[PDB]
Amino acid sequence: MILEAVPVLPPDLRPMVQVDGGRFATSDLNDLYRRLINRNNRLKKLLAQGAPEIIIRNEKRMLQEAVDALLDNGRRGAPVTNPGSDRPLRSLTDILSGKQGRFRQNLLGKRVDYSGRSVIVVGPQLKLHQCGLPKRMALELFKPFLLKKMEEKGIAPNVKAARRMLERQRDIKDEVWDALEEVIHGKVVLLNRAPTLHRLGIQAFQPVLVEGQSIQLHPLVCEAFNADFDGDQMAVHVPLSSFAQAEARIQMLSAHNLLSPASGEPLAKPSRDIILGLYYITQV
Amino acid sequence: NSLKDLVYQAFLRLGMEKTARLLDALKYYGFTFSTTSGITIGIDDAVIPEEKKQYLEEADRKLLQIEQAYEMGFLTDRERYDQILQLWTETTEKVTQAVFKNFEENYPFNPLYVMAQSGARGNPQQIRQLCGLRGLMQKPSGETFEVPVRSSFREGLTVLEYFISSHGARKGGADTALRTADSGYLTRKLVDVTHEIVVREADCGTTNYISVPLFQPDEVTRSLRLRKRADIEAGLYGRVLAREVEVLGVRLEEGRYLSMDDVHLLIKAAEAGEIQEVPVRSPLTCQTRYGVCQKCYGYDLSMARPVSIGEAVGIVAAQSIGEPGTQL
Amino acid sequence: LHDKHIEIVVRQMMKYVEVTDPGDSRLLEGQVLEKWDVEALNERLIAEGKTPVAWKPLLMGVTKSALSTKSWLSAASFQNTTHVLTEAAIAGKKDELIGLKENVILGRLIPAGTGSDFVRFTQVVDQKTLKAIEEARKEAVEA
Amino acid sequence: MEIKRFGRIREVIPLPPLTEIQVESYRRALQADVPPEKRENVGIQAAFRETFPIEEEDKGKGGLVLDFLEYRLGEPPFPQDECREKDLTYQAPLYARLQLIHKDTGLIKEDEVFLGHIPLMTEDGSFIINGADRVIVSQIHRSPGVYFTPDPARPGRYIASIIPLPKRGPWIDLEVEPNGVVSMKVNKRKFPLVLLLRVLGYDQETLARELGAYGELVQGLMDESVFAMRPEEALIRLFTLLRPGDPPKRDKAVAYVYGLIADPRRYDLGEAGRYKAEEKLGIRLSGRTLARFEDGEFKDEVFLPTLRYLFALTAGVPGHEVDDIDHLGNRRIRTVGELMTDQFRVGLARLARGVRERMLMGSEDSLTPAKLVNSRPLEAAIREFFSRSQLSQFKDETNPLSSLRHKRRISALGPGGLTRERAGFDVRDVHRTHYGRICPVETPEGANIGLITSLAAYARVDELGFIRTPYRRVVGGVVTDEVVYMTATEEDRYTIAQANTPLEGNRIAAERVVARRKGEPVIVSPEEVEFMDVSPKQVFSVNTNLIPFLEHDDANRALMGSNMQTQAVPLIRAQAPVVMTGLEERVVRDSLAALYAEEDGEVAKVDGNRIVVRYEDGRLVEYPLRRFYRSNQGTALDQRPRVVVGQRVRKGDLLADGPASENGFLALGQNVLVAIMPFDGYNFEDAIVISEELLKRDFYTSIHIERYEIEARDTKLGPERITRDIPHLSEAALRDLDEEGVVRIGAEVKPGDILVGRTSFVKDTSLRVPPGEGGIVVRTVRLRRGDPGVELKPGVREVVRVYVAQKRKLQVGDKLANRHGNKGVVAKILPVEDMPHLPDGTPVDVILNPLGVPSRMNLGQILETHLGLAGYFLGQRYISPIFDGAKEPEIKELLAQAFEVYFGKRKGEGFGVDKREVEVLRRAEKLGLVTPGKTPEEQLKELFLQGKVVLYDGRTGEPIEGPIVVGQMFIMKLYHMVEDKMHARSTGPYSLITQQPLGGKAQFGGQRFGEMEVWALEAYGAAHTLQEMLTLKSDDIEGRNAAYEAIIKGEDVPEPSVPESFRVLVKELQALALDVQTLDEKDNPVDIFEGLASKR
Amino acid sequence: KKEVRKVRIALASPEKIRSWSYGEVEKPETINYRTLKPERDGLFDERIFGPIKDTKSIVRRYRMGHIELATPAAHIWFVKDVPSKIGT
Amino acid sequence: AEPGIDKLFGMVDSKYRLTVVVAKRAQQLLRHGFKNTVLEPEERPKMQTLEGLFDDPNAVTWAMKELLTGRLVFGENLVPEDRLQKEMERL
Ligand SMILES: [Mg+2]
Ligand SMILES: [Zn+2]
């Protein structure tokens, strides 16, 4: 329960990677390991040569404090980087614990690759199982899908030629847009509102290619999301795996979730405008 | 409410696709007829009922005697304030009743009145503010001003009245700005504590249950009355009967999910006065190790059918608890 | 709001008991009720020895109930990794991958939803390949 | 086009200079204009005279006397134009005339020492710091002085606090403990005040005669008579109460440090603490504070009155004399001048300590200029205050209104020790004294609600953070033109009338007059009124006073509407609102955005960039124009000439437009035909429907300029050269890069095009147009090592900045709003043919959903729409005061005249009433809108009086059943930053520490997926979806590479392994002494790794 | 192949550490600025952590080193935790 | 939506089992190509512009409308797993 041989972390978990001009940004674990190795080598050669007892005690204390700092920094003093940079070094406990640590950073995953965001507008011409997606973000979101599908036909010889041809919008062709509508014929995308207060803050939809900048949203989900049309934005994600596509289309598609999980009340109920219209038509 | 009932019934009796198509067509026609029908708001649409005028005078007259009653020393500050508050909050309701009677009698097709009657937008309080009077305005200390706001937005507010209403505006803004994050934090707590609950089960042999009451134990000091229909619905809808019960010549067998019709039948029977409590299975008595069983959990979902085995009802439970907290 | 959710959280709120008459362990300790359910079943019935583990149900708030958990992954990810990991390190803590937060940290298939072993694996085969494999089956039953 | 005004009120005084607060503050802080001999000493000269004259009586080489004589500054090194083109600070060096004296012979006087550089404020009121310009917002906190607050726990008693400044200074607390104790804690340790009272030399007999005669709580101090016969040994005991370990033979060490200068506040005489003292208690406080050092003994003029009046309050009642923490008479505003002065005096004290050390280590004497004063401390303090302080914030030059409101914005928070973000709910609410001083509507929604505010338009800080509201003196029944600016504490003593009360000219016309007795709305007779409000405009801010119909609008909607008015982008052809309030000309004049004729004269020459005007003196002056100047937020500032060659002008007459002015009128938005009726679904909840008419003629169009920048710097590998040559491939596209490295001016640029060609070690690192949008390059600036007066970051040989301008036109993504908070978004741009149109061929411009009106409470826009309808036919504009606008009969009569004109023009062509109109009239008759039994003529006139007219669908041709309200409304396009821009990416740069994808400059970057989205996704049965979105798409490098390769190959993505997140977790537990291995069903370990865990 | 069901966390014996690690690191030389390759037996040494070129680099993510201290040491957690594990 | 989602909920006990089976079906439809279908003769997916839904525009809908027929059978352990799990991935 006290340790004799200290394990040494694999290098790629604590890499010194160059930033610019030969300088290397480093995890402080490398600095602490270097300090510990220097201290241990000093102790080794000291015991090898001679034993001035007071010096031996002093360097024993030095090694023990070095091991302490390696295991975790801050509890006994505040060992720091090279003098002039008063930023405390980062230790194993710092990597593991903390608000941004190994436990607390996989639990959120703040970044995702296939995602976008935009302002949303009413989409009254669309059905409830559909969402209006601007053509440019639709094109870029499914970019590998586009590459493969237009490689299925003779639009480009290889994927590299496809990327070079699509790299500029001056070379767009209607064949490209036909390939786009071919790609997303059955796919779905997940629309997400930033404050996700409940389960319906994520909802799958079928994208429909539209011309414009904003995402067209079916008005009836204006209350499933707590999203008005005062300009607030909403985001889009695209699951890749066919398994995940099945998940989204079956149990997250908005046409299938019409009732609350909090109660039996519907959430796809007719909204203000439709209510007023039908009250006007069925009044005496 | 009629539209919501229609949608729910169609969902029950038709399923998924037909309800979606009904919603699509219903929305489309509602839009078209709202367009062509021409509902518009002008300054004259916020009609001011004239009868309320004499009401004010009577209220005014009453104040004088109350003031005189306070001038003779018969009243203390607290009771005088209570009397004034009672008088103003009573005459405001009287004016609102007069306003709605006027709108019924005279202008059935008024835009403010049509959106008030229908579920489009607005409340009787908002319409009263528009056309009647937003009398009582609260003080920063939390109490309410003695001098009310006689004017409405149809008329013009005096400078002082707008300055006074700024207090409540600021109060509401700050309250929202804090309660948002507070409710988010509450949801975090709930999801952390209940993230283990998942329905994985064979029907646990639970010979235990909970007796959901059908009469309020205390609505008065000592009296029993059937709980409000919403309360009984939220307590019984989608549950599982613990044991067989027959109340009105209908044999509700043990192990039968209580659908909406069953809940209505039970409420009617309680109105007749046959039963007062329903024994139902519940999560509180489930013997499942980590989670609840399908029978002990129940029947309410995004759909109506009994819950599928294998969904994290704990997370959705926490979310359903926490979501309304933001607007609370 | 329906009462299923409130009932679920209240059940998770009072899943802890503290024993008073000691059995095969100390007395003034409180944790998951189902553990004494199993242990009393073993002590009185499954195994010999009529030692009653007399417990009392402890009601603690949401926070305390969240903190005291049998699994140490969620506890480490929740409040403080140092103390929790030390406690879980003194005794070999075989953390069962029950619960959802832990499997999130593991990144493996979440127990809930599709990842439930009840539905996690489900062989599917079309009808014609079914006839082919069934012919192979009946010819595998020789003579 | 005429203008008609409705309000019946005489503004006895106009609006004071809307930006006078900062100008007057800084001009009083810097006394450069006046000769240094002048008596004016407060501000920077006060700091000099206060701290800098160090004296050393006897320490080694004694007689050290470093004295102050004068100060001067008169020449910025560069004009502010270059100071913005090259990222300098518009400053002036400061010189001080100092002189050194010893006890022996010697007067070494150095007239000129440069001690730091201090920034200079521009004409408008801003400061240029490093290229960009900032503003220092005023701050509000406790006014220094004496306050009495109830005990937080004990209800019978209370406490008194004397609060000077700085915080590193005195803070006196007096409290009464009933056992006969007068407790007084100085800083951290409580102390029986009776000892200090004895120190000041008060004996018992006169104490009882003059203080204890009336109050019986004198026994709370007369009880302690044991140690009240000690004149000077009390000083020794009190110093012994302090624990510095020093010998007691220091008579004036800490006992006197609360003397004249060092610790106690130098609050401005009369008001800053004395008004808080002399009126609050006693009669007058001679000198600056309590002190005496002419005889060694001590005297005071504070403690005796404070204890007397506290005892009077706790025993009897001189009055309701408890000071509110938030009462505005007890709160004080530190302007930019005060903040600058305090930071300057901090730096000056640092310099004083430095020079003391230098003298202490100094050997000889002839070392006055150099070996004594170093500019580093004071310069560093000034620079940090003007660069990284909390109150010095980036100026919002979106439009003149934005900059003006920002310049007159008051903050409750600040450096941090005063008030912070976490909990401020007790103070966020307004008070009864905010009337006429602070706008209760200006607070920005969000976290900083109530903390950030703005003062009233008529509000004026007099000299010490004490806002004064104007008031007309009322004598008897006549309202006098005499105007007095009144403070809150002064205000609380009279009865204040209201501006809307009926007036017979010089006589009150009412019997019962509304008033505020003390912040309480009451009704009195005219004989009991003393003061009158000058104008309703004084109760709201400048930004609020621009809303026309405020009396018919909600407070919250007014708040947000005033906030959106601030962020309205200026348009190419903006026009003043049809309905105005009357402050637009004042706003454009007071904000230095337009050009005005300083004197009567005649214009000589008018060009697109300069105007040469010969005044009546015969002197000709040339005015240049910032033709297209990029703002802080990226908008454009243009001055458009408004005069013709050889045109006579008057004094103060307009010369050129501002960025957002039509003709001396604040014009940010457009006037459009709006019809309030729900279209199909395109105005569903708050969305907006617009015609292509607003686009066919460029009508909502704006200029947006983006400023890209790139550096060439010296690396260890070698310098980077910005050259036309491209290393590897791009030569065909190099034709745009005409000159060496820089792109040619006036060349259109698309995303992904080379903009600056920079070469590294040869490796191509060239700045390119970011993905998204690109416009027209307009300007390029290159700053190299050959510095004329410029500086660069060390190691950087050169820099080039490129400005790209583009013409944004209104489209679907954009948002619009009115002055009444009716936010919206363009949802569909309909062609002209299928939009609703009048019986005349004119089609409406914009369609508004009525359902947004009753949900909120904004009837102001309805009145505005009716008045705009009247103006559209009558061809005239209107001005209405916020609370003295046009009554309903007046606008009804105007609408009657407008209908007369409109239908007379209809009849002149020889037409009656359309059949569609006939049936719509019959339908409206069945709806009770129009009285029955009348011909279509007067029926339709009555319908017009309602503000409703018949419209035709345009798609069907059939009329819209029931009438619709239509009119002219003023709608502005709101500031449109990157908020709408599509942060939509697929594959871009990844992070270094972890493999989470994050871009920024190169790529947009991913989207937040947080934990709440994890919870929602996992509330569904989504399992593999969460797994891919947390590992495959976010973290696992080889997983995402394999997924990309497979999707290129058109195959299903592979399953993740036991994910590298958990393998990292296992190896991290492995790093410590821990033991983590995965187990099978039985107690046999399962190796996560293939064979990599096994050695060899 | 078998599904992970339990994760056991426990303490380490010195023999366990020796079996776990593949060699010992004893120079304080991660990588020189001149020689971008691992310099000597230090914190990034090639032959002790696996090759840096293309097994993959994941051995340099999985394979770990060790230091054989001549003097024993105690883990900071077991001496500084609020209940001192040695102290209790 | 999708053809007969209520019918799909009909023959399966839990929706999650439905998701698993349909997506796994899509997985063989990819791996062997869409030749291994059980709806070849007349009733195929019909694309709008052409008969493009004959081959593979979307596998999920293919699998679902495959499931509506009686030619699909699924079970927890219906076939000896090892043989087909090693013969599936190797062709
Ligand atoms: Mg919004
Ligand atoms: Zn159960």
Author numbering:
A (entry chain J): 512 to 795
B (entry chain J): 909 to 1236
C (entry chain J): 1363 to 1505
D (entry chain I): 1 to 761, 785 to 1119
E (entry chain J): 2 to 55, 81 to 114
F (entry chain K): 2 to 92
Task: Provide the publication's sentences verbatim.
Transcription termination is an essential step in transcription by RNA polymerase (RNAP) and crucial for gene regulation. For many bacterial genes, transcription termination is mediated by the adenosine triphosphate–dependent RNA translocase/helicase Rho, which causes RNA/DNA dissociation from the RNAP elongation complex (EC). Rho is an adenosine triphosphate (ATP)–dependent RNA translocase/helicase with 5′ → 3′ directionality. Rho forms a ring-shaped homo-hexameric complex, mediated by the CTD.
Cryo-EM maps of Rho, apo RNAP, EC, and type 1 and type 2 complexes are shown. When the apo RNAP structure is superimposed with the Rho-engaged EC structure, the opened clamp in apo RNAP fits with the bottom parts of the Rho hexamer without severe steric clash (protomers E and F).
